[PDB]
Amino acid sequence: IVGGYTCQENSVPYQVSLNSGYHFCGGSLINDQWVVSAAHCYKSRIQVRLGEHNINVLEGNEQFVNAAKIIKHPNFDRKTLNNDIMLIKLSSPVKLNARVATVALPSSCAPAGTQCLISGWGNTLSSGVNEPDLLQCLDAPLLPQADCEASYPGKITDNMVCVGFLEGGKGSCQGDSGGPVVCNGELQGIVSWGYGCALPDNPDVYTKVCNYVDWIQDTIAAN
Amino acid sequence: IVGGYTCQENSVPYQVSLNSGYHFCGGSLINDQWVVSAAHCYKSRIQVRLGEHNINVLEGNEQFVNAAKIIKHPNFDRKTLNNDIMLIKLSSPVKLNARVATVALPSSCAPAGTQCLISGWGNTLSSGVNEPDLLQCLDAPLLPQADCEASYPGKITDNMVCVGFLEGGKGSCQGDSGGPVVCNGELQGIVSWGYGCALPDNPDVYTKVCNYVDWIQDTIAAN
Ligand SMILES: [Ca+2]
Ligand SMILES: [Ca+2]
């Protein structure tokens, strides 16, 4: 997260870090046994870390659990990043508490102009790389589809929404991928892709969660 | 390497990739049993990969060897990046050939205006991250010390040299660290740090190898 602020500790309780020997993607806890992330974050072995604030320091609220089942959306297109959604079933249920909590699935598609919360341990620079220790937060609005499209001529599907600032300076970056976009307490997007980081005219693109609720439910039920 | 070109295969034979389960730094083969890198690339276990072109594909010329002894310069300052030089003794001597060859230590400090060759598997973007598969190359000049200093007021020591373009667009980035800066066939610098990547007014900084020859020799001899 470029140009965000440090979240208050454990203030984003559904935020998880996907770890493969290092943090590589975020995710969201949607029930005591399941995490939703980006399909582009797939790896054959993943340790899910919940209750984190400082990814490099054991603060006492961490829960570390291995991924049992990792399910990429059957129509994920690694080329367009269309259907960039994946589900992770935890090897075991976590203890839900103050610092480890679930986030609701969306009851509807949020309108353009809604203010959402984006979080992650992703790169904090507009140029070069700086990996933060503490979880970063960013308040940003949902843009109208037409600005989305204009920005990435021919690349936006209806399973994608733009979130951000057309003027630059703030945004999601590498390492924020698969993390949450929460609006009025519901998960509206999954951090997916953008061009550069925090650059003018290049908003962030998110997987539109409101398009997969069914998919999410069925999968969880069948698995 | 931002704005460089793809090296001709095995055309930079002394170039090594430092691997810890993934490429994280470059280095230079200076003899059949030793690699010079950046101290900031230290890790307690490293596999050195020589004869690479495509870091993700086994092309048939690779030599993979574990690091036996990893020696950071005793005055390395993790804060200023002063003395950012490290030596790696390979668990065993490599077979020197066409694609795996050594690069000479400098007989003298190169003058400003000399054209050097920079190579690496580092990030190729000015904003955001793109890790290349093939080794990237960049021809760039050595800048006068005064431009160096002006650029990073209070941060340059005499063990540092700037290499690059004051106008931006070309440069070393994350992942090129510890790699070579070769001028007229001799190792003149080790990729060390810069602000952003490929940005105007922010040249790259390299460890000045001509200041450590003695150190290099003694170490090799004593170890
Ligand atoms: Ca922690
Ligand atoms: Ca290879």
What DSSP character marks residue A209?
A: G
In this structure, the number of other CB atoms found within 10 A of the CB of residue A178 comes to 30
Strand order in the sheet with B115-120: B5-6, B136-141, B115-120, B180-183, B186-193, B204-208, B160-163
Residues of B in contact with A198 (CB under 8 A): 127
* Cα-based distances in Å from B79 to A85, A153, A159, A213: 40, 44, 45, 48
Q: φ and ψ at A145, to 5 degrees?
A: -50, -40
Residues of A in contact with B3 (CB under 8 A): none
For residue A149, the SS3 value is: helix
Q: Say if residue A185 is in the same domain as residue A161.
A: yes
Rg (CA), chain A: 16
Q: Which residues surround ligand 2, an ion (CB under 5 A)?
A: B 52, 54, 59
Distance of CA B70 to the CA centre of its chain: 16
Find, among A64, A61, A68, the residue nearest to A13 by Cα. Answer: A61
- Residues belonging to the binding site of B for Ca(2+) are 52, 54, 57, 62
The whole-angstrom separation of Cα A85 and Cα A208 is 9
**What is the distance between the alpha carbons of residues A90 and A41, in angstroms, rounded to a whole number?**
16
Contact residues for B14 (Cβ-Cβ < 8 A; gap 6+): B28, B29, B30, B101, B102, B103, B180, B182, B187
Which runs of E-coded beta strand occur in chain A?
5-6, 15-19, 23-31, 34-37, 47-50, 63-72, 86-90, 115-120, 136-141, 160-163, 180-183, 186-193, 204-208
d(CA B166, CA B169): 9
Q: Half-sphere exposure (CA, 13 Å, Cβ side) for A150?
A: 7
CB atoms within 10 A of CB A16: 28
CB contact under 8 A, B126 and A125: no
Residues A89 and A126 in one domain: no
Residue labelled with tokens 């998960």? A187
Q: What dihedral angle (degrees, nearest 10) is formed by the CA atoms of B46, B51, B56, B58?
A: -110
Bridge partners (DSSP) listed for residue A142: A163
Number of domains in chain B: 2
Question: With contact defined as beta carbons under 8 Å apart, do B203 and B166 qualify?
Answer: yes
Separation CA B18–CA B64 (nearest Å): 10
- The residues with which A82 forms a beta bridge, in sequence order, are A77
Provide the residue range defining the domain that includes B61: 13-102+211-223
Using an 8 Å Cβ cutoff, are A161 and A188 in contact? yes
Are residues B62 and B97 both part of a single domain?
Answer: yes
Q: Are strands B204-208 and A204-208 parallel, antiparallel or unpaired?
A: unpaired
Instruction: Reply yes or no on whether A214 is catalytic.
Output: no
Residue A2 neighbours by CB distance under 10 Å: 25
CA atoms of A33 and A192, how far apart (whole Å)? 23
Catalytic-role residue among B40, B53, B119, B192: B40
In this structure, the answer to whether residues A139 and A78 fall within a common structural domain is no
User: Among B112, B85, B100, which residue's Cα sits nearest to residue B189?
Assistant: B85
Regarding whether A109 and A4 lie in a shared domain, the answer is yes
- Which of A13, A159, A32 shows the shortest CA–CA distance to A84? A159
Partners of B126 on chain A (C-beta within 8 Å) are 127, 196
Please give the Cα distance from A100 to B168 (Å, whole number).
Answer: 45
Kindly tell me the sign of the dihedral angle through the C-alpha atoms of A109, A113, A117, A118: positive
Same domain, residue pair B197 and B144: yes
Residues of A whose CB is below 8 A from B128: 173-174, 194-197
- On whether both A17 and A121 belong to a single domain, the answer is no
Strands of chain B (E only): list them. 5-6, 15-19, 23-31, 34-37, 47-50, 63-72, 86-90, 115-120, 136-141, 160-163, 180-183, 186-193, 204-208
Give the tokens for residue B17.
Answer: 């990739």
C-alpha distance from B125 to closest chain A C-alpha (Å): 8
Asked about A40 being catalytic, the answer comes back as yes
In DSSP terms, which residues pair with A120 in a beta bridge? A136
Q: To which H or E segment does residue A150 belong? A: helix A145-151
Of A84, A151, A176, A204, catalytic: A84
| Residue whose pair of structure tokens reads 């050595």 in the numeric block | B142
User: Which residue in this structure is represented by tokens 């190169």?
Assistant: B110
B6 and B64 inside one domain: no
Task: Spell out which residues have Cβ within 5 A of ligand 1, the ion.
Answer: A 52, 54, 59
Using DSSP, state whether A28 is helix, strand or coil: strand
N residues, chain A = 223
Supply B106's token pair: 């400098």
Show Cβ contacts of residue A66 under 8 Å, excluding neighbours closer than 6 positions: A45, A46, A47, A48, A90, A91
Q: Which method was used? A: X-ray
Let me know whether B136 and B74 are in one domain.
no
Give the integer Cα–Cα distance in Å for B16 and B51: 7
Report helix, strand or coil for B223: coil
Cβ atoms of A143 and A158 within 8 Å: the answer is no
Examine the domain organization and report whether B63 and B76 are in the same domain.
Answer: yes
CB B81 within 8 A of CB B192: yes
Dist. CA A216–CA A209, nearest whole Å = 9
To what resolution in angstroms was this structure determined? 2.2
B109, two tokens: 């400090």
Count the helices and strands in chain B (H runs, E runs).
2, 13
CATH number of the domain where residue B129 is located: 2.40.10.10
Q: DSSP for B196-215?
A: SSS-TT--EEEEEGGGTHHH
Residue B57, C-beta contacts closer than 8 angstroms, at least 6 positions apart:
B133
Asked if residues A118 and B163 have their Cβ atoms less than 8 Å apart, the reply is no
Q: Is A118 helix (H, G, I), strand (E, B) or coil?
A: strand
Closest CA to B49 of B70, B31, B35: B35
d(CA A206, CA B139): 38
Task: Answer yes or no: do B27 and B95 share one domain.
Answer: yes
Residue A69's DSSP bridge partners are: A89
Assess contact for A32 and A93: CB atoms under 8 A. Answer: yes
CB A223 within 8 A of CB A86: no
CB–CB contact A174 B126 (8 Å): no
- A22 with A115, same domain? no
Going across the sheet that includes A5-6, the strands are: A5-6, A136-141, A115-120, A180-183, A186-193, A204-208, A160-163
Torsion of CA B99, B105, B111, B114, to 10 degrees: 0
DSSP symbol at A40: G
Q: Is the backbone of residue A167 left (phi > 0), alpha (psi -120 to 50) or beta? A: alpha
CB A36 within 8 A of CB A179: no
